[PDB]
Design an enzyme around this catalytic site. Structure first.
Site, PDB file in Angstrom:
ATOM      1  N   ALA A   1       0.952  -1.232  -0.373  1.00 15.03           N
ATOM      2  CA  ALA A   1      -0.170   0.006  -0.079  1.00 15.03           C
ATOM      3  C   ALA A   1       0.819   0.653   0.148  1.00 15.03           C
ATOM      4  O   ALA A   1       1.938   1.196  -0.010  1.00 15.03           O
ATOM      5  CB  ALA A   1      -0.844  -0.065   1.691  1.00 15.03           C
TER       6      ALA A   1
ATOM      7  N   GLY B   1      -0.485  -5.332   0.785  1.00 15.37           N
ATOM      8  CA  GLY B   1      -2.265  -5.175  -0.938  1.00 15.37           C
ATOM      9  C   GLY B   1      -1.715  -5.535  -2.053  1.00 15.37           C
ATOM     10  O   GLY B   1      -2.798  -5.897  -2.119  1.00 15.37           O
TER      11      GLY B   1
ATOM     12  N   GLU C   1      -2.660  -9.351  -1.616  1.00 12.42           N
ATOM     13  CA  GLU C   1      -4.060  -9.605  -1.913  1.00 12.42           C
ATOM     14  C   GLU C   1      -4.686  -8.904  -2.605  1.00 12.42           C
ATOM     15  O   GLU C   1      -5.876  -9.596  -3.111  1.00 12.42           O
ATOM     16  CB  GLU C   1      -5.098  -8.573   0.110  1.00 12.42           C
TER      17      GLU C   1
ATOM     18  N   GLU D   1       3.335  -6.191   6.995  1.00 11.23           N
ATOM     19  CA  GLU D   1       2.621  -4.845   7.388  1.00 11.23           C
ATOM     20  C   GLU D   1       2.595  -4.739   9.423  1.00 11.23           C
ATOM     21  O   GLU D   1       1.688  -3.731  10.019  1.00 11.23           O
ATOM     22  CB  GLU D   1       1.206  -4.363   6.243  1.00 11.23           C
TER      23      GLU D   1
END
Ligand SMILES: CC(C)(COP(=O)(O)OP(=O)(O)OC[C@H]1O[C@@H](n2cnc3c(N)ncnc32)[C@H](O)[C@@H]1OP(=O)(O)O)[C@@H](O)C(=O)NCCC(=O)NCCS
Lengths: 252, 253, 255
Positions: A64, A104, A107, A127
């Site tokens: 991210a 992310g 993900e 993270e």
């Protein structure tokens, strides 16, 4: 006019390439809005039957964004919820992943149906080190994919998992040499986009059902959709083709 | 002070060691009770950020005391709610690590599966041999093993009593990592230290998000994860981990 | 009974169901469905059986549901018949079942092997779900049981491209229990079924039911279910003898 992504149409295949190479294709709000708008647009186009999402040879997506404050601010904005538009896509989706698929990025790779990974791909959820949790379904899709012992391990330690381990654990569909990723993704995508559009959509929906209810209900749902295939031009053609030893001619 | 276990504290990590070597650490009512009591106390200790459970190099825990079960009626079993106390282990909010060497059989395999992370020595042998004595798993094995390794292999282990080595356990989803037997305990400390050095809060929330993937629909699990994600921007610890990363320094949670 | 599309043998405490449509690669028609379910059902009812093996030939376990039967099915025909529902009779069988898979198990062939509890495969085994491209999608549970066994990315891969998976990938992915050389398949399956059929009948039935639970509810629930089932076992004679025997360093004599 997209700033962070490129979009290309190739026959019945659409390709979304994350185009923010300096930031190692870090995911932000804008990326989220554009990726999601393009896939939704490709889903609505009857001339498209498969969607590829890919990054660079260095990074599918490295994470991210960090600069990107209250709880109410997060609750009211539903921070990250828009990503949900990727999962609501009916047309089959394919994550072609090279190098870093972290946070992310891991993900996002997991939101696609099919995952073809390069030689060089590395997955992880690091993270926790920043004192941050997954917000894009990582604790959900990771665990269902690789099981608890490894999911916990990756999420609590931040360790990475290489392509070979992701393949043997259930994270990826198949692994290919790095140089060949884009051609293998495209050939896979091409094969799927040449299927009956109805059958491909039905098949994908039935599989997704595997995480939303008990086996008994999933079995029932699948059997019902399967009967519905029989109300379509394409079931008749597909089976006629087999019996007549010929290529099937779908008009989707 | 305990009768069948040892408990050791070193920094922010707790270590429970089964201490019935003559009996290969076979589980009994007393062992169940102590581990749960120790686990719960380490969980309640604010200066503890990770818990290890281990046995010896020969056996993590091979089977149970069968004399304590031979003459149980359904009524005694139902009344005692036999085995239910082991649920206290799964209810621990701090991350737990099973460091398994040698035999982890029956209850012992089930005990390993209750922990969050599973670190196995190359010597580890997993199995649910209950079938042989006319019973089925009683401590969640039919549930956890199947979820870890799939129907085909779980049916195989539970119906034949066959064992599975450390390598098959790694490829099939049962263990987190396989390490050499000699490095087992040190490697568990390394992993426990790393975990114990995370925000205690974030580490617990992450563990709780993962556990949800076995309790509801993906749809529900996604929503729960997002809500809890938003809640960790509240909390001091996320400023520090963030500043640490920009300043290329270690976080002081 | 007397069957057209299958062969049925019984030896001691093990029954074997062998698929017998070699002119069509054991492709699964309604006749096969009914005959397999009736046979399995009547073996499940026999007190002298403790395990059931389902197998095909060295060349094909089954290469799918019968396409000629399906080609001339109308939506009305399929909805009226509840086409395929009857396979559910096999999943309701209480005695442990073993799939012994050589060669092709594709479509309903893969689905059929997935309905069994234990799946022993020849190194020669080939799994897949190529229904897509006949213009359909799995209709016998593949989209459900495959995904659950091997995970989303691989189940989506197979189901949308219809690619095949060989025995070694199947074994590492969670689809099969064990692989053996093809020549030993039948020897092996039979040794496995012997072991299971010599176990306590109630214990093996309870344990099978408990495992099946793990796909049907949340973990909290399954755990409570297993434990309650465990406590009932204490009312069974075989628990008593199984545990008595162990304590006395002898072999159990199940009545
Ligand atoms: C498995 C397979 C690859 C190997 O085939 P092969 O070695 O070339 O052999 P054939 O096709 O000759 O073999 C089989 C024949 O058996 C029949 N057969 C094979 N599979 C069949 C099926 N599923 N339904 C009906 N008949 C089948 C063929 O029609 C042919 O019969 P015919 O001789 O009377 O015309 C191939 O038969 C095939 O793929 N069949 C269909 C698989 C499928 O799509 N399955 C499920 C998705 S809906």
């Amino acid at each position: 006019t997209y700033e962070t992504i490129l979009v290309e149409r190739d026959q019945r295949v659409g390709i979304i390439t994350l185009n923010r190479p300096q930031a190692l294709n870090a995911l932000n709000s804008q990326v989220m809005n554009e990726v999601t708008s393009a896939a939704t647009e490709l889903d609505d186009d009857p001339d498209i039957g498969a969607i590829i999402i890919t990054g660079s040879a260095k990074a599918f997506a490295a994470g991210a964004d960090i600069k990107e404050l209250t709880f109410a601010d997060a609750f009211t904005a539903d921070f990250f919820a828009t990503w949900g538009k990727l999962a609501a896509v009916r047309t089959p989706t394919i994550a072609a992943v090279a190098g870093y698929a972290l946070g992310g990025g891991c993900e996002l790779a997991m939101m696609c149906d099919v995952l073809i990974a390069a030689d060089t791909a590395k997955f992880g959820q690091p993270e926790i080190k920043l004192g941050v949790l997954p917000g894009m379904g990582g604790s959900q899709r990771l665990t269902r994919a690789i099981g608890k012992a490894k999911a916990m391990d990756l999420i609590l330690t931040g360790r990475t998992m290489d392509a070979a381990e992701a393949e043997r654990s259930g994270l990826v569909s198949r692994v290919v040499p790095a140089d060949d990723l884009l051609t293998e993704a495209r050939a896979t995508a091409t094969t799927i986009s040449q299927m009956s559009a109805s059958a491909a959509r039905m098949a994908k929906e039935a599989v997704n059902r595997a995480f939303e209810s008990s086996l008994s209900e999933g079995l029932l749902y699948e059997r019902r959709l399967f009967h519905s295939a029989f109300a379509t031009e394409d079931q008749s053609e597909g089976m006629a083709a087999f019996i007549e030893k010929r290529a099937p001619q779908f008009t989707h």
